[PDB]
Scaffold this active site. Structure first.
Site, mmCIF file in Angstrom:
data_model
loop_
_atom_site.group_PDB
_atom_site.id
_atom_site.type_symbol
_atom_site.label_atom_id
_atom_site.label_comp_id
_atom_site.label_asym_id
_atom_site.label_seq_id
_atom_site.Cartn_x
_atom_site.Cartn_y
_atom_site.Cartn_z
ATOM 1 N N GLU B 51 2.683 -10.112 5.181
ATOM 2 C CA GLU B 51 1.270 -9.852 5.238
ATOM 3 C C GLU B 51 0.409 -10.933 4.571
ATOM 4 O O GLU B 51 -0.314 -10.665 3.618
ATOM 5 C CB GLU B 51 1.040 -8.409 4.666
ATOM 6 C CG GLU B 51 1.624 -7.354 5.635
ATOM 7 C CD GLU B 51 1.445 -5.923 5.160
ATOM 8 O OE1 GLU B 51 1.571 -5.578 4.010
ATOM 9 O OE2 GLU B 51 0.982 -5.134 6.097
ATOM 10 N N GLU B 127 9.147 -3.464 10.221
ATOM 11 C CA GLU B 127 8.780 -2.178 9.631
ATOM 12 C C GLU B 127 8.423 -1.285 10.792
ATOM 13 O O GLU B 127 7.752 -1.736 11.749
ATOM 14 C CB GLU B 127 7.481 -2.219 8.759
ATOM 15 C CG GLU B 127 7.624 -3.273 7.647
ATOM 16 C CD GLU B 127 6.449 -3.520 6.710
ATOM 17 O OE1 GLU B 127 6.412 -4.477 5.886
ATOM 18 O OE2 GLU B 127 5.567 -2.544 6.788
ATOM 19 N N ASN B 187 -7.484 3.017 -6.616
ATOM 20 C CA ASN B 187 -6.052 3.250 -6.350
ATOM 21 C C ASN B 187 -5.851 3.726 -4.895
ATOM 22 O O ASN B 187 -6.812 4.088 -4.223
ATOM 23 C CB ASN B 187 -5.478 4.278 -7.302
ATOM 24 C CG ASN B 187 -6.082 5.649 -7.050
ATOM 25 O OD1 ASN B 187 -7.002 6.051 -7.792
ATOM 26 N ND2 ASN B 187 -5.639 6.299 -5.980
ATOM 27 N N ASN B 194 6.420 6.542 0.572
ATOM 28 C CA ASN B 194 6.718 6.462 2.026
ATOM 29 C C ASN B 194 8.213 6.538 2.324
ATOM 30 O O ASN B 194 8.665 6.115 3.415
ATOM 31 C CB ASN B 194 6.311 5.028 2.534
ATOM 32 C CG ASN B 194 4.962 4.531 2.031
ATOM 33 O OD1 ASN B 194 4.794 3.327 1.759
ATOM 34 N ND2 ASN B 194 3.957 5.426 1.981
#
Ligand SMILES: CC(C)S[C@@H]1O[C@H](CO)[C@H](O)[C@H](O)[C@H]1O
Ligand SMILES: CC(C)S[C@@H]1O[C@H](CO)[C@H](O)[C@H](O)[C@H]1O
Ligand SMILES: [Mg+2]
Ligand SMILES: [Mg+2]
Ligand SMILES: [Mg+2]
Ligand SMILES: [Mg+2]
Ligand SMILES: [Mg+2]
Ligand code: NA
Ligand code: NA
Ligand code: NA
Ligand code: NA
Ligand code: NA
Ligand code: NA
Lengths: 1011, 204, 193
Positions: B51, B127, B187, B194
């Site tokens: 990323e 992913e 936050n 996950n």
């Protein structure tokens, strides 16, 4: 911190690199390239003090001038001011190899400047200082506070002084280190000097400003349409009212314009660049740029407000051109280039490495006038003006990163080490960021002689990625590695392979077709022009012409790097390695140019000009066929002048306009040619003349020539009477011949013609003897030294075989009277401690007309090295003013370097028959001569010769031309055969076999007579 | 094995990765990884990070690896998952059949991606199947596709274990905490959880 | 030099990277992958004190244990010891985006260790220290003297201590910065510790 011994630190607080800026605040000045009040020069008189190490600089210097300092001109290299010596080393590093450390004794140059700054520059915006070139590293302070540090001696280092300046008087303090960790990346073959050697300037930019801009041009398939794309970046506070306008002008007309607010297209999941914008302008029928016709447009980049108020303007010259490699060929605007290039270092005999416009323009003009169309930046980015000049006068440029680690063992020791990737990366990226908008730059180079390491692969890919418009090349590691788009060898020969391990140099013809190979081949270096050289140059051109994928090369190199020294009277002299007490050094190896340091050409330049001609010719009967090698222009500033002469006597001549399209052909019919009513060879000479002046040449410039032999009428007729018979007088020691005025004397003990008289006047200072050697050229010597002999070098082979020490032993000497002449016959053996090297058999026939015919038949033992020459030599008693000959000329020419010379009748001053190469050697030869005239003397035949006031012995015993002294009389070397001079390289035997005197048996004959 | 380079919060994502000033810092994160791990047989693919958009620094580093260690492919998802800086098309969360044609960086159906004009690389999702809380709905759809299409060579589920941290109530009783639970602000709350297993490794 | 605000500086005096080493002096041991007398673990109880910014660190620390420090287990994340809070942010960076700068309030972990070195290690050869993971940047001193600095929280940083150590007792001091220019390349979706 010792930042200068840490390759992880290449700069501190340095600003990002970018293309040339001027911060104009008036659009018109930007458009017309006028000076900008926002860009000031700090060049001039500065204070300087030299120190032996950084640890010796007094703290005091930061705040106040040193009473001991001197006042000197900047830019400069301190060695040129005499503070320390410049060093001439080729491969071996000038400092002990122990990266990243440098010597603790490290010459430090403390420069300082007290200057004024207007408060208006401080009240708003940003004031930066720009150091275009500081060698090799430096720290900067302003008004006593530390600002930053920079490395890479050949790119600009910039720093924001906004917060350091005060209104009024300010003082800069610059501590320049001669050696640094960057030096390990600066091992180029040239003088090692140091200092603030390029310009220093102050640039005022607004706070909200143009921080970068990139210009690209893409075309349609036939180049009849293009799109100009300008990416622009800003720094400063973004506001919605901000705008960028890019306008494109052709002279005074605006052909296109685009305006937009900032905010680029979406790049990724996070959005796009809010601080950038790209303008796209269409251009129909653009005037294309090339070295043939360097059409330019002007791009003006304006930062302004929506309501039309200008913030600042930047701009550049734009050359619409596409460079691409397709199907194995380098194309410019769709056509395959033929690179007539040369490598050029930045060198000035008085100023060292500081460059000035006048010298630059001089160089470009000479290049263009000598048919070069390209230059390689060996081996670092150049002074910025260079590129401007190339864009406008039209030369294709190879821009090269400043990275050379030749002295490493192995050569890729640093380039394959990821610890050096950062340092290397900046030398490449910052060059691209600086020069990417110059049209003249057509190829990027990763550097030179640094082996091939993974760092090169990474950098190659970086460029490929950021600027897809220009191929990338790099020769290291064998010239065809995965880090180069072009097979770019240095010194690969035409036909001969040099199969070195790991990095072979194949024959260029062979290289292209190696299994799987498909790239174009352009030598990054070839035809090493060191001393009397460029032998075999024509062999390269013929090959370039025949093979599509052989697209040329860059000769090594343009100008000798000799430096000026003065004798006791103040007369200047050319110096080379070692001359400043520098040691170790590489002596004359710094002088390899086509031109001497003062731009006077060496004779080899003319060979290049001829071979690099843009028009080729064929002759068939009365038809001349001209073929054009231009790709883009018609011959609209050209006419062909032809002339026919018999033994130099002009028969007829004419002119014809040339109207040849690029790559076209034109047939020219010559008229009937009233053939000579006499014996002799008729010669046809054509020259292409530029009737009109150009930006780089005068009206009348000769751009190409060629000659052919036409009819030959052998002489059969013999007549004219036996008026007088010569008389022979014999004594035990001599044979004496006399005819009228003239007397010829042969010594019976030596067997040579030892004296000749005209009237009562003696003519010889030294007897006529055979000669088989020559004062060795640089190519004959190569890298051999008294200290470390190279037994393979020609000079060494010659010395070992005893050629220079050979003694003539008389085998036979007889005199016979014939009916109308006296016939003398001799035979000598030259031997060396028992071995017979050569045998010379001759006959001298003196007839009633006073002519002496000499016949010479020489045997050369098959087992001694082939001799440098097969001729005669003597020292003539007289010194005359002119030398007149019918043969090849007018400049110096050797067997493997004579294509440019023309057969005609030439007449020059004696001085002209001697070429003053700095490291003296045999020189001045002229070949294919049928008649030579000097004084009352005349020699006829078919020979080669040289004539000067210097003996071969003297040339060979003297290392610098300034030490030569005219001898009494004139030394005449007359050769039936002379070996090639070579030059493919200057470090291994390079004389092609067909030019070595290997025939074993040789015959020549001469006729000596008086006038 | 993946380099420690992620600059997700930049705008645009490749702001540092395309800037040559950051090439040095990026470079060491890749080179020093290769120098430490290259002898491990388990490492079959190198990754340039995650990323961080697609910038010129990635292309150079992609090339550095290919040159120094030819034994393992190089992959990198940034900039649209099929850039010049990757040997494998390795999208994150591209769906089986449904295209998600976002501008510049679309996520095409994986079945369709393989066959775009000119494409020939294998595709392995870096992913997929975001296992956040009650999730994994449609997991079988992927497997079915992986089995049927030779060039769909699988993927890496996101992710192994919930990143919850233990906190203690007033009375010393441990409980599972997430973003914001430590006063941390701003936050992203439960997005740190996950995994296919809870932090203590009990399975979901 | 504020090295933690300069992406041009990622380390100082750090040794080159290489594959796992143990310097066995017995071939059989290397063959069997047994422990090596030449590779020692310094993990265990160390001294630690938290500060709000590097500037708050007292020079005395370089030479003397701070009495206020606590004894803690290393390796560890100081947030898990309760010194400050761990931060859960996904994409948005946990610090203002203004490369290469980081907040002036930058939590600083002062770790130290008093340990012994056998004289044999000093009489011959080279002794280096290896930090497998320090987040996110740090300076290192040994016996009061500065050794070097390192960035990249996920690869080992090694320093040659041969010239800094003494037979017997030595004291290392490690000043670890929570935020550095390295943080800009460490924006992974996970707790920031
Ligand atoms: C002499 C060779 C071993 S190296 C040779 O030296 C030349 C001397 O002019 C040039 O510097 C060449 O580029 C280099 O290859
Ligand atoms: C929330 C999306 C816009 S970004 C999405 O967030 C996930 C949260 O677990 C993972 O971190 C993914 O890698 C990231 O792409
Ligand atoms: Mg340095
Ligand atoms: Mg060299
Ligand atoms: Mg001018
Ligand atoms: Mg840093
Ligand atoms: Mg992320
Ligand atoms: Na060709
Ligand atoms: Na040279
Ligand atoms: Na014409
Ligand atoms: Na000489
Ligand atoms: Na599959
Ligand atoms: Na998450």
């Amino acid at each position: 911190r010792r930042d200068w011994e840490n390759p992880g630190v290449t700069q501190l607080n340095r600003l990002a690199a970018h293309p040339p800026f001027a911060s104009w605040r008036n659009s018109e000045e930007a458009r017309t390239d006028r000076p900008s009040q926002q860009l000031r020069s700090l060049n001039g008189e500065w204070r300087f003090a030299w120190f032996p190490a950084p640890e010796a600089v007094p703290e005091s210097w930061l705040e106040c001038d040193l009473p001991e300092a001197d006042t000197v001109v900047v830019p400069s290299n301190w060695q040129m001011h005499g503070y320390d010596a410049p060093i001439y080393t080729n491969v071996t590093y000038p400092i002990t190899v122990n990266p990243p450390f440098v010597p603790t004794e490290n010459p430090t140059g403390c420069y300082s400047l007290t200057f004024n700054v207007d408060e208006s520059w401080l009240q708003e915006g940003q004031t930066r200082i720009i150091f275009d070139g500081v060698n090799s590293a430096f720290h900067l302070w302003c008004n006593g506070r530390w600002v930053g540090y920079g490395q890479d001696s050949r790119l600009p280092s910039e720093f924001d002084l906004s917060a350091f300046l005060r209104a009024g008087e300010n003082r800069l303090a610059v501590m320049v280190l001669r050696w640094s960790d960057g030096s390990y990346l600066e091992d180029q073959d040239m003088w090692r000097m140091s200092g603030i050697f390029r310009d220093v300037s102050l640039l005022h930019k607004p706070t909200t400003q143009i921080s970068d801009f990139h210009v690209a041009t893409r075309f349609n398939d036939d180049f009849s349409r293009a799109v100009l794309e300008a990416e622009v970046q800003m720094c400063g506070e973004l506001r919605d009212y901000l705008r960028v306008t890019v306008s494109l002008w052709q002279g005074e007309t605006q052909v296109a314009s685009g305006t937009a607010p900032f905010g680029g297209e979406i790049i990724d999941e996070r959005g796009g660049y809010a601080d950038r914008v790209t303008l796209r302008l269409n251009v129909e029928n653009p005037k294309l740029w090339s070295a043939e016709i360097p059409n330019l447009y002007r791009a003006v980049v304006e930062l302004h407000t929506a309501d039309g108020t200008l913030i600042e303007a930047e701009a550049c010259d734009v050359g619409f051109r596409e460079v691409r490699i397709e199907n194995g060929l380098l194309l410019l605007n769709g056509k395959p280039l033929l690179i007539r290039g040369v490598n050029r270092h930045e060198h000035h005999p008085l100023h060292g490495q500081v460059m000035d416009e006048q010298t630059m323009v001089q160089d470009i003009l000479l290049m263009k006038q000598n048919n070069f169309n390209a230059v390689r930046c060996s081996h670092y980015p150049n002074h910025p003006l260079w590129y401007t000049l190339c864009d406008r006068y039209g030369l294709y440029v190879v821009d090269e990163a400043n990275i050379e680690t030749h002295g490493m063992v192995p050569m890729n020791r640093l380039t394959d080490d990821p610890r050096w990737l950062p340092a290397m990366s900046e030398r490449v990226t910052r060059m691209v960021q600086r020069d990417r908008n110059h049209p003249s730059v057509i190829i990027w180079s990763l550097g030179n002689e640094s082996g091939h390491g993974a760092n090169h692969d990474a950098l190659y890919r970086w460029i490929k990625s950021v600027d897809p418009s220009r191929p990338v090349q790099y020769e290291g590691g064998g010239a065809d590695t995965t880090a180069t788009d072009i097979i770019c060898p240095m010194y690969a020969r035409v036909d001969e392979d040099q199969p070195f391990p790991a990095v072979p140099k194949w024959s260029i013809k062979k290289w292209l077709s190696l299994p799987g190979e498909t790239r174009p081949l352009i030598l990054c270096e070839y035809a090493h022009a060191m001393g009397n050289s460029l032998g075999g140059f024509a062999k390269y051109w013929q090959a370039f012409r025949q093979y599509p994928r052989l697209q040329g090369g860059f000769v090594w190199d343009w100008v000798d790097q000799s430096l000026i020294k003065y004798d006791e009277n103040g007369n200047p002299w050319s110096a080379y390695g070692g001359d400043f007490g520098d040691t170790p050094n590489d002596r004359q190896f710094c002088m390899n140019g086509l031109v001497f340091a003062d731009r006077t050409p060496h004779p080899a330049l003319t060979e290049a000009k001829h071979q690099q001609q843009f028009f080729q010719f064929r002759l068939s009967g009365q038809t001349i066929e001209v073929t054009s090698e231009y790709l883009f222009r018609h011959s609209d500033n050209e006419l062909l002048h032809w002339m026919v002469a018999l033994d130099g006597k002009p028969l007829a001549s004419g002119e014809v306009p040339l109207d040849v399209a690029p790559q076209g052909k034109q047939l020219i019919e010559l008229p009937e040619l009233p053939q000579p009513e006499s014996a002799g060879q008729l010669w046809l000479t054509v020259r292409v003349v530029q009737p009109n002046a150009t930006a780089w040449s005068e009206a009348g410039h000769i751009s190409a020539w060629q000659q052919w032999r036409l009819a030959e009428n052998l002489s059969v007729t013999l007549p004219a009477a036996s008026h007088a018979i010569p008389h022979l007088t014999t004594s035990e020691m001599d044979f004496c011949i006399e005819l009228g005025n003239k007397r010829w004397q042969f010594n019976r003990q030596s067997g040579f013609l030892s004296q000749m008289w005209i009237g009562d006047k003696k003519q010889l200072l030294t007897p006529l003897r055979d000669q088989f050697t020559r004062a060795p050229l640089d190519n004959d010597i190569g890298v051999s030294e008294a200290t470390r002999i190279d037994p393979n070098a020609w000079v060494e082979r010659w010395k070992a075989a005893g050629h220079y020490q050979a003694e003539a032993a008389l085998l036979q000497c007889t005199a016979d009277t014939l009916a109308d002449a006296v016939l003398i016959t001799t035979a000598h053996a030259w031997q060396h401690q028992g071995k017979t090297l050569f045998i010379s058999r001759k006959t001298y026939r003196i007839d009633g007309s006073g002519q002496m015919a000499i016949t010479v038949d020489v045997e050369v033992a098959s087992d001694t090295p082939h001799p440098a020459r097969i001729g005669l030599n003597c020292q003539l008693a007289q010194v005359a003013e002119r030398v007149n000959w019918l043969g090849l000329g007018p400049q110096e020419n050797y067997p493997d370097r004579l294509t440019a010379a023309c057969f005609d009748r030439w007449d020059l001053p004696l001085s002209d028959m001697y070429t003053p190469y700095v490291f003296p050697s045999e020189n001045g030869l002229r070949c294919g001569t049928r008649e030579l005239n000097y004084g009352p003397h005349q020699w006829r035949g078919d020979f080669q010769f040289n004539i000067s006031r210097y003996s071969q012995q003297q040339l060979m015993e003297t290392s610098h031309r300034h030490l030569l002294h005219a001898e009494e009389g004139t030394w005449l070397n007359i050769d039936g055969f002379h070996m090639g001079i070579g030059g493919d390289d200057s470090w291994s035997p390079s004389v092609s076999a067909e030019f070595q005197l290997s025939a074993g048996r040789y015959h020549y004959q001469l006729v000596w007579c008086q006038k």
